[PDB]
């Protein structure tokens, strides 16, 4: 039933301090129950990081510290290091059975260990052969960007298109930059009736937009 609300994402450069908030309620943190923190490195089992609001287990560096106030709690990481890039979960408890254990929504900490790299965007129209199979897929390929976070929006002529869009989560390439792809599924008739279709990629505040048209 209850959840503790956390920011989906936090980033910082190596050496800086970052904080992760954890918003609870009058029935858990506000009622006097303790707060715990877990760290989950990618591919690994979650690990206890903080217990009893501000205690650290052995094996946890003093760079991590926890705090609680009113209905909220906070995890602070000083001297951010590459190894701290991970998902972090807060946890408490409440008074009802459903809330025996209450968990946070999780926060991905990104450690910005290399400079920003802008995405290259490649947009392919439906192939004639796919049109003959009564389908139409536009393919938007996004590569060589850092950090690994993008949003994609599609447009038909000049109006947004939400239906038929599937976009991957960014994944790391061999050069430690990131790649992602977005697909717009249309009927052959939709492809031919509109004048153009666009893939707009937003990365760190800047946008790259490519357009194709059936009349190419």
């Amino acid at each position: 039933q209850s959840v503790l609300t956390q920011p989906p994402s936090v980033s910082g450069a190596p050496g800086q301090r970052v904080t992760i908030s954890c918003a609870g309620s009058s029935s858990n943190i506000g009622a006097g129950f303790d707060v715990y923190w877990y760290q989950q490195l990618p591919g690994t089992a979650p690990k206890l990081l903080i217990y009893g609001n501000n205690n650290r287990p052995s094996g946890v560096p003093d760079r991590f510290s926890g705090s609680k106030s009113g209905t909220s709690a906070s995890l602070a990481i000083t001297g951010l290091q590459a190894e701290d890039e991970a998902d972090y979960y807060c946890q408490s408890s409440g008074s009802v059975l459903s809330d025996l254990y209450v968990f946070g929504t999780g926060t991905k900490v990104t450690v910005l260990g290399q400079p920003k790299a802008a995405p290259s965007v490649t947009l392919f129209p439906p192939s004639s052969e796919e049109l003959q199979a009564n389908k139409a897929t536009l393919v938007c390929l996004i590569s060589d960007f850092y950090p690994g976070a993008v949003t994609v929006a599609w447009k038909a002529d000049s109006s947004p298109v939400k239906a038929g869009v599937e976009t991957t989560t960014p994944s790391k390439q061999s050069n430690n930059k990131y790649a992602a792809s977005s697909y717009l599924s249309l009927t052959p008739e939709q492809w031919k009736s509109h004048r153009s279709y666009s893939c707009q990629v937003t990365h760190e505040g800047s946008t790259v937009e490519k357009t194709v048209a059936p009349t190419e």
Binding site: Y51, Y101, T137, V139, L141, A179, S185
Partner: protein, 221 residues
Amino acid sequence: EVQLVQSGAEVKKPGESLNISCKASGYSFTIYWIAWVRQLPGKGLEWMGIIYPGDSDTRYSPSFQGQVTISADKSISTAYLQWRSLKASDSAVYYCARGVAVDWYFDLWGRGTLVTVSSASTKGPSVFPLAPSSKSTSGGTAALGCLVKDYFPEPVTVSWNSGALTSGVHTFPAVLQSSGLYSLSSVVTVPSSSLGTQTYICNVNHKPSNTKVDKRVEPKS
């Protein structure tokens, strides 16, 4: 050393039964509570229930009471999570975790078991060419590729020219569609001056469907 070892990923259709497991080592199994915790795609963690392995005393969260059965086998230090009838909405990562005495937290976790519940059936891909384009590539080069559409399960393997062409190849991770099926693209960047003389074939293999495709990718002209 204390460890909790969970069984591997599962793929099931709705209406099938399933049990997943968590083997404890390094401590006295019977005197610590074991919990099961669910993580739905894009969500946080949610506790499902806990069991005391010494006497198999079990407590369930009300949400999951009657949807799952938790049990334990002392002889082999293993706890189980069991569904009689799975649903698509049961697709999630399931964690085993060891509770602490008195305080309400966990000091030891398993790595998690991915359970995927889908009506998707084994299906081989349809492969379509992505005809070369020089619009977004560096000077003197062109990008061509193949679209590998609507297959299940992962993975497909893509090579180019029977593995003779490896430089400039970028096979993108697949996208999971709402239909339950996967699609991916593989693109290779080649010299523009080669498009008329060099043949480019993408070799797509999907072992689960025993499908093999060798698709020529030609200029549109």
